[PDB]
Design a protein around this ligand. Structure first.
Ligand code: HEM
Ligand code: HEM
Lengths: 131, 131
């Protein structure tokens, strides 16, 4: 992640954050339609789940200048995901769906350059989570 | 529906409406989780679909004192639904899921009395759409 990518993340988050509740919920709707098999893994209220996901995305943005500082928390999160029945192959599907959902909700407000930066940040988070 | 029910619809809409985008999106997530098969019927972006659904709920509220007046609109809507592949048994599924989603998102802010009124209104709408 270069300084240009870090900037795009911070800038796009200013448009994501005010829309975070809707984006998170759209993401679940899209995920469950795209991959009908994974919805069985989500066993708590989706409203609450969405808030948790978007909170962590916020934490990634807040620490975007030092992501290594987040290795521990991301490792713990990946470990809990194993306990939820999540496997490595789920991660690209969720990443694709999340990025497509942000794109859908924000439209032109979300640039290709921003989407590319978020792709890399997600890939990094998923790498740490799956070890 | 009776006068008290009409009032409950109007008053409870004051809490539903400001949250309507979130409730709509949560509804599709819950719907697609509960019955993954229906998600194939939804061909257009879910963000736009949720807005359309919540627009019609708003119309039901606007017309709540004279639902008889909306019968032609609801009949047209029901006719279009048939074309989408929607069938009678889908209506209770959608109704249950919609009410549960409003309940989930608002928590105790969605009163037992308001929920009972909304249950009856959805039932009426469903009946007109499918008659
Ligand atoms: C960057 C990637 C991801 C992030 C930031 C993330 C974030 C979270 C968070 C914050 C929670 C709350 C529970 C906890 O903290 O342990 C959670 C739970 C969960 N996540 Fe993820 N997640 C990611 C990827 C995935 C993937 C790929 C899946 C695959 C389906 C997934 C499925 C689940 C499930 C099933 C739960 C538990 C739901 C329940 O409580 O029943 N997550 N995730
Ligand atoms: C119960 C009250 C319902 C209301 C108020 C409602 C509202 C709407 C509205 C406003 C549209 C936009 C298109 C149009 O106006 O014709 C729509 C489309 C649609 N509805 Fe409903 N609906 C209801 C019930 C259902 C049910 C029970 C199903 C069963 C799955 C369903 C599935 C669909 C599908 C598949 C579409 C088309 C999506 C697309 O554009 O591909 N709806 N609905």
């Amino acid at each position: 992640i270069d300084q240009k990518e870090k900037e795009l993340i911070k800038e796009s988050w200013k448009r994501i954050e005010p829309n975070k509740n809707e984006i998170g919920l759209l993401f679940y709707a899209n995920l469950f339609k795209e991959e009908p098999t994974v919805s069985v893994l989500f066993q708590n209220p989706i409203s609450s789940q969405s808030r948790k996901l978007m909170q962590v995305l916020g934490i990634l943005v807040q620490g975007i200048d030092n992501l290594e500082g987040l290795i521990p928390t991301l490792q713990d999160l990946g470990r809990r995901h194993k306990q939820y029945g999540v496997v490595d192959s789920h991660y690209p599907l969720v990443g694709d769906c999340l990025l497509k959902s942000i794109q859908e909700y924000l439209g032109q407000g979300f640039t290709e350059e921003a989407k590319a930066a978020w792709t890399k940040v997600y890939g990094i988070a998923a790498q740490v989570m799956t070890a």
